[PDB]
């Protein structure tokens, strides 16, 4: 019924690959740093508008 097989004396490791994890970390760091810039710019615009 599609069930898998069993191997004696083996063990099933994790499916995580560090190589792609590191580049994904770079991507997410850059995206976060960019999104912070929108908050900074909105704050600056509000500050300029306040000083009228």
């Amino acid at each position: 019924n599609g069930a898998g097989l069993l191997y004696q004396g083996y063990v099933e490791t994790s499916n995580v690959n560090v190589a792609e994890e590191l580049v994904n970390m770079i991507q997410v760091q850059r995206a976060y740093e960019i999104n912070s810039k929108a908050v900074s710019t909105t704050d600056q615009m509000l500050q300029k508008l306040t000083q009228l």
């Binding site: 560090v18 190589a19 590191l22 580049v23 770079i26």
Partner: protein
């Protein structure tokens, strides 16, 4: 089969075949170590950015 008294069986081994197998196994083991070293360097360059 029939037995034979007063005699003993040998070790059924060949020195030349064992020596060449030793050499080939050593070469294969070093070849795998080369792959291990390549993986080590390829991960070190990525972690160091």
């Amino acid at each position: 089969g029939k037995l034979t008294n007063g005699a003993l069986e040998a070790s059924n081994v060949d020195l030349s075949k064992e020596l060449v197998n030793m050499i080939v196994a050593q070469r294969n083991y070093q070849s795998n170590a080369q792959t291990i070293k390549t993986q080590d360097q390829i991960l070190n360059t990525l972690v160091n950015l």
